[PDB]
């Protein structure tokens, strides 16, 4: 009574496409729905969190003291940061935006990075860090860096320091492919003035850094995310 | 953006290779190949093989699924030649809390209630097994054992179990070799996730236990150079 | 007048402790411990309500963060076992819904640098010693009052004590979606977490099931000026809020 | 004229999928509906009635004293009942709430245990029966059954007794696969007083028990109900 | 429950044939659509330019 | 990824997979002054790989 046609891409398999699918138990009520906290809709509410950042990893083995930054006393005009802003490699892969990040392709959107010092109250200094945008080389001490966009909020009578990073359109997106360029952005920190430790002292004091994204992330393309050129069929 | 992109239904309902196996169907006996991957297989399904080695259901504690189970078989012996006449294959989802198949000509394949296909070799079929489980969410993550009585098994906590899903031929007569290979691809519906969880550092070492892998290497890179960035 | 912070009276029960430094509150989500986990079942009720005479602030053994320190971790429902109505309510019962409110306070004087890290992991499943096929085998778990106790102290056939891994496989600096609040001691020198009821079953047996670990653990080292002792101390009191049991006029005795 | 698509599960045969097939007797009225009593649309109605219990079941062939619970004089502080409330299992296992909770899976509800004496009229008796929840060690004695839920609705001037068993929800519902845990629930009596025996009676007395579901009773999912290992294809 | 026929070009492979395909990424924002110059719908505006004529093309 | 049986078809939809706003066929440029990727072949608008292979054995 009803005539129709074929299509081509008959007997298709896509794996991919969202069509409503008979069901095995047809009449069966499963364990009702109940309230639970945390409800989560949305990944960007998972990377709205500061995580850390591990900045002090370069030693061998991973301990605890990965992520401090170590200041020391009467060192001034010189590095205390430098990072390259490439979230997915470098000191940056293994956050919560790290394998986000690696989860997705081409991103978009301003960040949320922070500061906190760890130390005694009676102890004062001043430290500029400064943000270059990507595309522009990193400054070299603390003079280039005082010509960019410098941030002091020094450190004496304020711990957390919280400075947005704006976002860019570069070719209208990030570069989502394993390169060592050099236009991701670029964030370090100098001392302005020497460490002024409290009197004996007599050892170093660290700085914690966080990283997320503010709500204006963006994520885009999904990814097959091999990470380690994964295979594993084990099953028990 | 209301786009269903990167949200949780989007991230966790494309759909996967989870349990490559590969049946035939010989005879009664016949030659001594009968119990190990020939004339039937029962899978016990777990999600814990293959999303990518338990990743992004792991970074969340409490998902609640509706599994769309979508079973490719295909004829290993070439099905280009022959090997494939009306070689019909069995699909079969044993709930939990019912007995399994141990056998190919055994009662439970055409029991009472237990949900069973039949489908054209080299054709697929598509399932909606809705939340089966015991508590409210799936536990994909959880502290505790079953009980401080007798204690069913151990932590690996098969007490939320989703299902068992078995697959057989019913052909005959011994005279000639055929092979099936069976590949199903988990897809899950309504995803609705709780309770985010840090992520993994290495690949796993076990299902159900949440143990980290000993002898590890680095899972964190070293500076290049050092604090000095460039 | 001047300074006002929340310091007075917070006195339930035996528990008088109103001892807050910087007394601003973290709850662990937009969910406050709630009583009633539904309305009724359209009948008289007999409701066991133990809000009355559970809700004291149980303090626990105090412990001492030195410069070689590495961590302490307690399983929330099961640390207070042996101790208080609570937990002769929860040998008593089987199954009880228990929500928490844990304050931790280190004593720390003005001149002592260092920064800890409390965090509240629901269903924390443990990682093991072993680290294979197998996990501790619930003696090693939940000592009560004691806890894991991460600071050096390894042994053998139950869990690790690696604290990067944070006996979870995760990393200690992505811990962070838990809720959780830094204890820094240029700025504050106690913590309070508001721990709501967490679990897929609406009632659930504590004697079985861990619901929480708590742990605090020292980020920065700590560094007390030289000539002092080389030792901070750590109080963690738990205050069971809005805490309810199942076993309403069916228990009578059961002794271990 | 009406173009169309394939779907993947073409050629999908379904056992248990509700599809509309054309008749083969197209045209031909029944033998028509006509109303006999007893008209039953639902099994919780089967299992609304209380069957019995067999509790004497401890004799080696199966005779009518299998229901008998026996009530001799002169006995106190000592057992009358015992019984583990697995049904499906044991001694509740061959009764209609038996082979019916056998049909389904997991389950719910509370029941109706009711209990009748069978003895003179001028005799008397006090029997405490107590119920122990499922997860707690039952009692030893009459001491520890009266410090329980205690029953007694003696005999002596009153022979029916019913006792309502409700149901605690352990992990969502109840585990119904083959095991001897020790948390279903746990059912026993005990003397109060010895039995006074009516004089020159010389014998025994005996108990009758029945069991079934209060309408709060559910049932949830199905099963393949083997029972004995099923196969026969014996056809006449 | 929706009878149904048969149509002989079954499985045909119309070239030219406008039909609407499903989407191999069913849910991707692309790189949205903005204003650049020059906006083209027909070949006559393209035409509509006098070019020129090689006519001393006889080297 | 599609499946389909040999001797038949399967079609598609690929949306606008473009790194630029449209495709730029015809473009002046390179790809930085920078690294560089490769050169003025200008893959940076890329569309996308196709890939084919067979599923049998034997």
């Not at chain 1, 947005?164 to 236009?183: A, E, N």
């Not at chain 3, 619930?138 to 056939?157: C, K, M, Q, W």
Request: aromatic share 10%; with cysteine.
């Amino acid at each position: 009574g009803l005539p129709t046609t074929t299509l081509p891409g008959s007997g298709q398999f896509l794996t991919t496409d969202d069509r409503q699918s008979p069901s095995a138990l047809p009449n069966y009520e499963p364990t009702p729905r109940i309230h639970i906290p945390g409800k989560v809709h949305n990944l960007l509410e998972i990377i709205q969190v500061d995580t850390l950042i591990p900045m002090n990893n370069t030693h061998t083995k991973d301990e605890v003291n990965s992520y401090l930054i170590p200041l020391n006393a009467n060192r001034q005009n010189e590095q205390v940061f430098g990072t390259n802003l490439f979230i997915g490699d470098g000191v940056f892969k293994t956050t919560l935006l790290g394998e986000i990040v690696q989860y997705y392709t081409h991103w978009s959107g301003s960040l949320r990075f922070s500061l906190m010092y760890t130390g005694p109250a009676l102890s004062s200094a001043k430290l500029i860090l400064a943000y270059t945008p990507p595309g522009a080389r990193g400054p070299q001490d603390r003079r280039e860096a005082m010509l960019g966009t410098h941030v002091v909020w020094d450190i004496g009578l304020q711990s957390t320091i919280v400075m947005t990073i704006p976002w860019t359109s570069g070719v209208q997106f990030r570069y989502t492919d394993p390169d060592t360029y050099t236009s991701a952005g670029f964030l370090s920190c100098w001392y302005q003035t020497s460490l002024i430790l409290p009197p004996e002292t007599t050892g170093q004091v660290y700085l914690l850094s966080f990283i997320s994204a503010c709500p204006d992330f963006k994520l885009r393309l999904m990814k097959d995310t091999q990470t380690i050129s994964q295979t594993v069929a084990l099953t028990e | 953006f209301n786009g269903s992109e990167t949200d949780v239904e989007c991230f966790l309902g494309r759909a996967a290779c989870v349990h490559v196996t590969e049946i035939q169907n010989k005879d009664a006996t016949g030659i001594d190949n009968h119990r190990e991957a020939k004339l039937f297989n029962d899978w016990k399904i777990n999600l814990s093989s293959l999303v990518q080695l338990r990743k992004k259901l792991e970074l969340f504690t409490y998902v609640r699924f509706d599994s769309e189970y979508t079973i490719l078989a295909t004829a290993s012996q070439p099905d280009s030649a022959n090997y494939s006449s009306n070689l019909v294959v069995q699909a079969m989802y044993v709930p939990p809390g019912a007995p399994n198949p141990k056998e190919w000509d055994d009662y439970t394949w055409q029991s009472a209630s237990n949900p069973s296909v039949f489908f054209k070799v080299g054709d697929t079929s598509r399932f909606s097994v809705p939340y089966v489980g015991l508590a409210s969410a799936y536990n994909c993550f959880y502290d505790g054992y079953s009980h401080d009585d007798a204690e069913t098994q151990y932590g690996i906590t098969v007490l939320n179990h989703m299902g068992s899903m078995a697959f057989r031929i019913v052909n005959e007569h011994d005279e000639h070799k055929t092979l099936v290979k069976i590949r199903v691809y988990h897809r899950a519906k309504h995803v609705e996730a709780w309770i985010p969880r840090a992520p993994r550092a290495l690949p796993y070492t076990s299902i159900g236990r949440t143990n980290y892998p000993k002898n590890t290497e680095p899972v964190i890179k070293k500076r290049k150079g050092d604090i000095k960035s460039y | 007048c001047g300074y006002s912070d929340r310091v007075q009276q917070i006195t339930l029960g035996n528990s008088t402790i109103t001892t807050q430094e910087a007394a601003n509150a973290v709850v662990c989500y937009a969910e406050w411990p709630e009583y009633l986990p539904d309305v009724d079942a359209s009948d008289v009720n007999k409701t066991s309500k133990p809000d009355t005479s559970v809700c004291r602030f149980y303090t626990l053994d105090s412990k001492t963060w030195t410069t070689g320190s590495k961590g302490w971790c307690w399983k929330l429902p099961d640390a207070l076992k042996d101790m208080g109505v609570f937990g002769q309510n929860m040998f008593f019962h089987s199954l009880g819904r228990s929500g928490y409110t844990v304050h931790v306070q280190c004593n720390a004087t003005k001149f002592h640098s260092g920064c800890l890290l409390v965090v509240v992991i629901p269903e924390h499943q443990l990682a093991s010693h072993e680290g294979g096929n197998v996990s501790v085998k619930y003696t090693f778990t939940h000592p009560g009052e004691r806890g894991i106790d991460l600071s050096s102290a390894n042994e053998v056939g139950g869990p690790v004590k690696d604290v990067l891994y944070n006996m979870n496989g995760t990393l200690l600096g992505n811990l962070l979606i838990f809720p959780h609040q830094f204890i820094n001691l240029r700025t504050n020198n106690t913590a309070t977490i508001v721990i709501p009821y967490i679990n897929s079953v609406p009632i659930d047996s504590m004697t079985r099931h861990n619901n929480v670990s708590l742990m605090v653990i020292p980020i920065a080292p700590l560094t007390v000026p030289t000539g002092a002792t080389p030792s901070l101390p750590i109080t963690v009191t738990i205050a069971p809020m809005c805490t309810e049991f199942s076993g309403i006029r069916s228990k009578s005795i059961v002794p271990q």
